[model samples]
Target: MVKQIESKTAFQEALDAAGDKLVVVDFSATWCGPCKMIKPFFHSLSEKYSNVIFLEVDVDDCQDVASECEVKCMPTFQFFKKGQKVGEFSGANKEKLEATINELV
Candidate 1:
């Protein structure tokens, strides 16, 4: 399932709560065209990967969380395993994103 994180606390909590599941976080923004372009595919991944935890965080809405995650650009994808960051990428490459998920999960 996909969860939308609106606050820094919730972002932190979600990481801690994920246990051993692979957590995929999409750090995006509303004005970003690339972010919007990749969202549909990203959402579809959530349905396909039932064992993975998907999270969407709007950088503008959750500034604190964005800062904590060190997001410097829109559409930054972060992967975590057991509460620790393992991989990441910036942009809207669907193939690369899916490949990352496939490799991790």
Candidate 2:
């Protein structure tokens, strides 16, 4: 299941807890249409990847974190490994997102 980040503190904690594991964070908003569109697919991937840590970060709730992460677009997906950001992409490209997961996992 995907963990929801409700605050900047929680976001930092999630990154720290990720450690050497792969952490995929979905940077989105409650009112974004693209964000809503990709949510189901993201959740499905979270369920499929039993060993990976998936997280959902609402830009509205964690504005500071979102600004710090440079999330300029809705439905931006950030990939992290060993507590460091590895890659990221914006928009609702399902194929790219899944491919990224496959490549990392």
Candidate 3:
């Protein structure tokens, strides 16, 4: 299922629960158009992939999350496995997004 993380606590929990499985955290904001586009895509991915731990982080409300992750762009997707970052994507593009995750984790 797709989870919504509102603070640092939920963020860490999401990562912890993912364990060694592929986890994709979409750092987004309410004002970003591209971020909006990626939301449904993320949810769809979660439904399609059995081992994925997909989540959305509101950058506007969770500034600390962005700071801790050192995210510099809207719709920044950070991939984690075994509680460590393994891949990422910024800006927006469905093909690039899918390809990166497929190729990386």
lDDT on C-alpha atoms for all candidate structures: 0.89, 0.86, 0.79
What's the distance in Å from true for residue 46, model 3? Answer: 1.0
Tens-digit per-residue lDDT, 1-105, candidate 2: 999988777888888897777899998988999889889999999999878899998877756434445678898999988877888999899999999988886
lDDT of 3 by residue, 1-105 (tens): 788888787788778877778888888889999888767777888888768788888876665434545688898988888778898879877778777778866
Predict model 2's lDDT versus the native: 0.86
Question: What C-alpha lDDT, on a 0 to 100 scale, does residue 54 get in candidate 2?
Answer: 97
Report each candidate's C-alpha RMSD, comma-separated, in the order given: 1.7, 1.8, 2.0
Ranking by TM-score: 1, 2, 3
Per-residue error at 66 for model 3, in Å?
A: 9.6
| TM-score: the better of candidates 1 and 3 | 1
Task: List candidate 2 stretches off by more than 4 Å.
Answer: 64-67
Question: What TM-score does structure 3 among the candidates reach?
Answer: 0.88
Select the stronger candidate by TM-score from 2 and 3. 2
* Candidate 3 lDDT for residue 50: 65
